Amino acid sequence: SKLKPFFALVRRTNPSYGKLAFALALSVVTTLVSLLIPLLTKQLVDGFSMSNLSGTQIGLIALVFFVQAGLSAYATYALNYNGQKIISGLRELLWKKLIKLPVSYFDTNASGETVSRVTNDTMVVKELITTHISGFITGIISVIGSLTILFIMNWKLTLLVLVVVPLAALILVPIGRKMFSISRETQDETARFTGLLNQILPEIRLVKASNAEDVEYGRGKMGISSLFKLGVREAKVQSLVGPLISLVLMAALVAVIGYGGMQVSSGELTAGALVAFILYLFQIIMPMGQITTFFTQLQKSIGATERMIEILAEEEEDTVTGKQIENAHLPIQLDRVSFGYKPDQLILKEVSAVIEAGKVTAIVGPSGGGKTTLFKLLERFYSPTAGTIRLGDEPVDTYSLESWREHIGYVSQESPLMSGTIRENICYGLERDVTDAEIEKAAEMAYALNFIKELPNQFDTEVGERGIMLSGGQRQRIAIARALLRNPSILMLDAATSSLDSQSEKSVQQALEVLMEGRTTIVIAHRLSTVVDADQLLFVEKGEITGRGTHHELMASHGLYRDFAEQQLKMN
Amino acid sequence: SKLKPFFALVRRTNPSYGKLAFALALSVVTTLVSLLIPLLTKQLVDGFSMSNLSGTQIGLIALVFFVQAGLSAYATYALNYNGQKIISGLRELLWKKLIKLPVSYFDTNASGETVSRVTNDTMVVKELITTHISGFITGIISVIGSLTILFIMNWKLTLLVLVVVPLAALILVPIGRKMFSISRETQDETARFTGLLNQILPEIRLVKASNAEDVEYGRGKMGISSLFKLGVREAKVQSLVGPLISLVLMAALVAVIGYGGMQVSSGELTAGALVAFILYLFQIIMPMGQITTFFTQLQKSIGATERMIEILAEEEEDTVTGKQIENAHLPIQLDRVSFGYKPDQLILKEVSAVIEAGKVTAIVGPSGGGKTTLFKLLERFYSPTAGTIRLGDEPVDTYSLESWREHIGYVSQESPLMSGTIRENICYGLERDVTDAEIEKAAEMAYALNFIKELPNQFDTEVGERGIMLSGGQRQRIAIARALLRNPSILMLDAATSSLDSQSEKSVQQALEVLMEGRTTIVIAHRLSTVVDADQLLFVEKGEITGRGTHHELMASHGLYRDFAEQQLKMN
């Protein structure tokens, strides 16, 4: 029942059954050959009365060994290659999914955790498919066949003590678990002592100033004393565990091998059966560890499969809603919009406002209100539930989200880079039009070519994977140019201002003003430099829009009491 | 030659030779018993023609096994206990040293690195002393004795192939190294892919806004494709390595054990010698790994010993300079002080100033000048080289640094806590006087008892190891109380004042003003609230004191041009 999701997930990479089954069957045949090699060794041992059959037997054993090696090599290659294909398919599906999950999943959930889930679960599934399933089948077949052949060869007298010995291993195992428990306790004590030292050392200035060094010495001494005490206990336990484990192991070996030798001396049914018995001993010892690893990694793999299944269940739409974009130039109105992240909290209550077309509008919000939520709502990262963010009769209820994102430009505060070259930064506007070869020419219009005129290169100019050799202001200028290059119709600004300084603010703002005066602009930032360039101003407070109109006189009056209190808080 | 520092470091814990040598000798005897057990097994195997000597032989073997187990247990306990004693001594010496190393070592070197060095090197020395030296001796003795006894038992015919087999291991080993190389390459590729995904995901907002999701999909696909390519190579290599390693191993086993069986069938000099031969095989296989681990950990241990030796070489003086404190109340003058961290740079040049006795003096410094260096120099954490920071005729060249630290109070900015209870915070002033039971009464004078009057407790009030449930202001007030409790004669303030605001700045400042108006006070902080309470003001610039006199008119005039430019930089 639990294996059904795993089988379905493997089935997502459908053309992977025949070769995997063939590889598993060939691994089974290779395993059955390892059960025949000791029999040939026994025949060779028993046939040394004449020296001709001996050499023939070494030849035959060498040939069988080479055949087994070749078959095992082919089976391992097939298994590993099929597992790699399955992992490639799984990673492709996961990445295609994820680059398309709504931004809400990432914001309200976990960024690095998703990457860790994908990377670890794919590798665990690989380890299960290529090694652990085939390993378990091989181990079970090897153990059963070796036990059966030993039972046929020797009646039971030595096989019975062979199966009794795992009871000695069974009493041995709790001792090893106690070893791990004591070791973990000692490690925890060592970590506590290290934490205490890392507590003390940074404030050595305070330690010296109070002149209480000896006090800290004694404290440290107490810590090491505790460590020593635990060490003494682990010394007693290791003195009890170590030699005893050795003793039991040797007692098993002496019992088994010695008994075989005894049956050799009495004249019983084993000499070459004794040699094959030792070989079967090794072929029984190895697969037990293989099966245990199989079970552990099977538990890990069912967990990983459930995680990958829950990741592969998310949904989203890009153009499913409709296709009705013709102009994208209408006044934007808010109509009783009340929805945040979860319907229970209601982090937004009937927010409504009137914004014209081709009019710069500024948004002023508090430190903890609904300015970020309104930013994401106006950028259409959340789906409306009760209210309507309405352009255009809600053919903003029947056009495509992809088309709306096409007609909007977005740089917020950092927008550092999509690392690579500047070519990608200007070819992210390659929307089937391909901008022919006018991209750098756009930089000429967007005041970017002259700024980049130092020209390390134009295509080999590498910002690096890290992207640290260029600062924020130049990159924000590049994003402004990208917005001007993509589809300069609607602009949505959080007004990225970092290390640009007053001289650059005016440069980039006058460039954007000349390029986008006839088109709609939206600003959401903090300062009062965009608001003066904004024809209409708004204000967000307690998840509600409170304030409409022009900037100068209204903000001089509206911002007199409560917005002024908020400001006086802000400088403080 | 290289072992001499290690021997000396062990010699620092002198009374640890006799019992360690006895434990090593008993481990040797225990090892020599394991070379006799297979011989008794061979005798038992050969003596099964009669069943009485058989049972006597099982009895004797069991007795020898129990004797060996007991001896090994005692030897292991002695070795582990002696190693724990050595580690306790080493940690005690290291902690006593480092709590007394000049603050310069910590500031210009590494805090967490020293803790890591102590913790790791002590454990490595433990692992070498308790296990690896005895392990190597045991392994060498076991291998040599087993080879000699096999040579005596069997002439050479099977021992020769036994020593030939390690050549098969020798050709096997490079294959395993190639396995590790390919695995490391695959791991590096996986890490690169994970880094690429962690690059992409956080900016999924920018990814969606540009509407280039497919582009990021294809990029990710390329990454996974590269992974798959490397996986294919590792599939080919593992298909060549795995079965081949198995084949060679089995070929060795079949060769050796089978040959023994052949000598059994022909009537040669081994049946119970074959059983003992297999036992000696195990007793030869284990110590090779033991010796290899010994060599690796010996290299690690010589490195750790050199590190611990260089840590145990630092020096400092507390009262070595002299003992001439009688009053500690004299004007403090600076006389051509020119010394920073290293004499080459000269990060301080002839700094001189005149400060009176019982006069509050403020220090104003820039963001990157010599204010921190002058702070540490005036607090005596660095040793003068050219100039003289002179009180008192330089009996500040002949009194004790410990006494000077006794007569000074220090809280700078955080001084968070020496975690524990408030009892430690008020018993760090326990200077042989023991303040009788007046500590809380001092808090009554120092405006601290009324502030702490909520009383969760007075001795069970725990701030925790972390120390997070109380903020900075209360702890700074406790530090001020501690300074008033220790020896309120000279105060050195970086001003604990922070974001506490007037409610608390004025409260703590008026408490300190009432308690310490008749005594000398030194302030080094940034703002202009301490300077107005400071009778004389100074200023640091480019590692030189530039400005002397009162606050109001001089700072109004001196701070008009250049200090005002620095300020206008500071608000900007």
Domain edges within chain A: 1-319, 320-572
Nearest alpha carbon to residue A539 among A516, A564, A507: A564
Sheet holding B388-390, edge to edge: B351-355, B332-337, B388-390
Tokens 């598993």 sit at which residue? A24
Entry resolution in angstroms?
3.3
For residue A541, is it left (φ>0), alpha (ψ between -120 and 50) or beta? beta
Tokens 């050195």 sit at which residue? B492
In angstroms, how far is CA A240 from the centroid of its own chain? Answer: 44
Q: Which of A16, A94, A204, A522 to mutate to test the interface with B (most CBs of B within 10 A)?
A: A204
E strand segments, B290-357? 332-337, 351-355
Nearest alpha carbon to residue A280 among A166, A150, A160: A150
DSSP secondary structure of B151-217? HHHS-SHHHHHHHHHHHHHHHHHHHHHHHHHHHHHHHHHHHHHHHHHHHHGGGHHHHHHHT-HHHHH
CB within 8 Å: B115 and A80: no
CA B112, B115, B118, B119: dihedral to nearest 10 degrees?
Answer: -110
Cα–Cα dist A220/A197, whole Å: 8
Cα–Cα dist A257/A274, whole Å: 8
Cα–Cα dist B473/B416, whole Å: 9
Q: Which of B250, B271, B275 is opposite residue A65, by nearest beta carbon?
A: B250
Residue type at position B526: H
Q: Which of B103, B208, B282, B427 to mutate to test the interface with A (most CBs of A within 10 A)?
A: B208
First to last CA, chain B: 62
First to last CA, chain A: 62
CB within 8 Å: A68 and B264: no
Q: List Cα–Cα distances, A181 to A93, A187, A192, A237, A238, in angstroms.
A: 42, 10, 17, 11, 12
Q: Which residues of A86-96 are buried (b: 16+ CB within 10 A; e: fewer)?
A: bbbbbbbbbbe
Cα–Cα dist A44/A53, whole Å: 8
Residues of A in contact with B261 (CB under 8 A): 41-42, 45, 271-272, 274-275
Q: List Cα–Cα distances, A494 to A356, A531, B114, in angstroms.
A: 19, 12, 46
Per-residue tokens: B256: 């050796």
A151 vs chain B: nearest CA distance in angstroms? 20
Q: Which of A61, A99, A261 is opposite residue B45, by nearest beta carbon?
A: A261
A1 vs chain B: nearest CA distance in angstroms? 31
DSSP letter (8 states) at residue A129: I
Residues of A in contact with B262 (CB under 8 A): 44-45, 48, 54
Contact (Cβ atoms closer than 8 angstroms) between residue A271 and residue A43: no
Cα–Cα dist A428/A437, whole Å: 14
Nearest alpha carbon to residue A180 among A246, A99, A248, A241: A241
**What's the longest Cα–Cα distance across chain A?**
117
Nearest alpha carbon to residue B418 among B356, B345, B332, B479: B479
User: Phi first, then psi: what are they for A493, rounded to 5°?
Assistant: -110, 130
Nearest alpha carbon to residue B511 among B427, B433, B446, B440: B446
Burial class (CB in 10 A: 0-12, 13-18, 19+), B182: middle
CB within 8 Å: B253 and A216: no
Cα–Cα dist A26/A77, whole Å: 11
B119 vs chain A: nearest CA distance in angstroms? 7
Cα–Cα dist B42/A262, whole Å: 9
Q: Which of A95, A189, A421, A487 to mutate to test the interface with B (most CBs of B within 10 A)?
A: A95
Q: Which residues of B183-192 are buried (b: 16+ CB within 10 A; e: fewer)?
A: eeeeeebbee
CB within 8 Å: B228 and A84: yes
Q: Is the dihedral of CA B159, B163, B164, B166 positive or negative?
A: positive
Q: List Cα–Cα distances, A464 to A405, A419, A470, in angstroms.
A: 28, 6, 10
Tokens 């070749």 sit at which residue? A70
SS3 B401: helix
Cα–Cα dist A455/A450, whole Å: 10
Residues preceding discontinuities in chain B at C–N > 2.5 Å? none
Compute the radius of gyration of chain A from its Cα atoms: 37
CB within 8 Å: A262 and B68: no
Contact (Cβ atoms closer than 8 angstroms) between residue A33 and residue A39: no
Nearest chain B residue to A62 by CA: give it: B251
Cα–Cα dist A212/A214, whole Å: 6
Nearest chain B residue to A110 by CA: give it: B202
In angstroms, how far is CA A55 from the centroid of its own chain? Answer: 58
CB contacts < 8 A, A to B, total: 313
Compute the radius of gyration of chain B from its Cα atoms: 37
Q: Which of A74, A238, A416 is opposite residue B80, by nearest beta carbon?
A: A238
Cβ neighbours of residue A341 under 8 Å, at least 6 residues apart?
A: A104, A108, A347, A373, A382
Cα–Cα dist B29/B71, whole Å: 8
Q: Which of A69, A204, A210 is opposite residue B428, by nearest beta carbon?
A: A210
Per-residue tokens: B121: 């090197």
Contact (Cβ atoms closer than 8 angstroms) between residue A59 and residue A47: no
Cβ neighbours of residue A14 under 8 Å, at least 6 residues apart?
A: none
Sheet holding A490-493, edge to edge: A408-411, A490-493, A520-523, A360-364, A536-541, A544-545
Cα–Cα dist A380/A367, whole Å: 22
CB within 8 Å: A262 and B44: yes
SS3 A148: helix
Q: List Cα–Cα distances, A510 to A475, A476, A480, B320, in angstroms.
A: 17, 14, 12, 70
Domain range A320-572, its CATH number among 3.65.10.10, 3.40.50.300, 3.40.30.10, 1.10.10.10? 3.40.50.300
Nearest chain B residue to A196 by CA: give it: B465
Q: Which of B101, B103, B213, B257 to mutate to test the interface with A (most CBs of A within 10 A)?
A: B257
Q: Which of A213, A244, A282 is opposite residue B100, by nearest beta carbon?
A: A213
CB within 8 Å: A84 and B118: no
Experimental method: cryo-EM
DSSP secondary structure of B22-70? HHHHHHHHHHHHHTTHHHHHHHHHHTTTSHHHHHHHHHHHHHHHHHHHH
H/E element holding B364?
strand B360-364
Residues of A in contact with B54 (CB under 8 A): 262
Q: Which of A49, A87, A208 is opposite residue B265, by nearest beta carbon?
A: A49
CB within 8 Å: A197 and B84: no
Contact (Cβ atoms closer than 8 angstroms) between residue B105 and residue B314: yes
Number of Cα atoms under 13 Å in the Cβ half of residue A562? 10
Cβ neighbours of residue B485 under 8 Å, at least 6 residues apart?
A: B426, B429, B435, B439, B442, B446
Cα–Cα dist A230/A71, whole Å: 53
Nearest alpha carbon to residue A518 among A316, A358, A327: A358
Which is it for strands A408-411 and A490-493: parallel, antiparallel or unpaired?
A: parallel
Q: Which of B95, B195, B235 is opposite residue A84, by nearest beta carbon?
A: B235
Angle at B380 between CA B375 and CA B385, to 5 degrees: 100
Per-residue tokens: A51: 């020296």
- Quickly count helices (H) and strands (E) in chain B: 19, 9
Q: Which of A37, A199, A217 is opposite residue B419, by nearest beta carbon?
A: A199
User: Phi first, then psi: what are they for B457, rounded to 5°?
Assistant: -160, -170
CB within 8 Å: B45 and A408: no
Cβ neighbours of residue B32 under 8 Å, at least 6 residues apart?
A: B141, B145
Cα–Cα dist B328/B326, whole Å: 6
CB atoms within 10 A of CB B254: 21
Per-residue tokens: A396: 């903003």
CB within 8 Å: A265 and B49: yes
Tokens 């220790």 sit at which residue? B486
Burial class (CB in 10 A: 0-12, 13-18, 19+), B222: exposed
Contact (Cβ atoms closer than 8 angstroms) between residue A338 and residue A499: no
CA A560, A563, A565, A570: dihedral to nearest 10 degrees?
Answer: -130
CB within 8 Å: B250 and A73: no
Q: List Cα–Cα distances, B419 to A116, B11, B463, B468, B484, in angstroms.
A: 36, 36, 6, 10, 20
Contact (Cβ atoms closer than 8 angstroms) between residue A491 and residue A338: no
Q: Which of A73, A207, A227 is opposite residue B240, by nearest beta carbon?
A: A73
What is the 3 state secondary structure string of B409-464?
Answer: EEECCCCCCCCCEHHHHHHCCCCCCCCCCCHHHHHHHCCCCCCCCCCCCCCCCECC
Residue type at position A387: G
Question: Which long-range contacts (C-beta less than 8 Å, at least 24 apart) are formed by B402-405?
Answer: B402/A211, B402/B318, B402/B319, B403/B319, B403/B323, B403/B325, B403/B328, B404/B325, B404/B328, B404/B380, B405/A208, B405/A209, B405/A211, B405/B380
CB atoms within 10 A of CB A102: 17
- Quickly count helices (H) and strands (E) in chain A: 19, 9
Angle at A476 between CA A470 and CA A478, to 5 degrees: 85
Contact (Cβ atoms closer than 8 angstroms) between residue B515 and residue B481: no
Question: Which long-range contacts (C-beta less than 8 Å, at least 24 apart) are formed by B183-191?
Answer: B183/B234, B185/B230, B186/B227, B186/B230, B186/B231, B186/B234, B189/B226, B189/B227, B189/B230, B190/A119, B190/A123, B190/B227
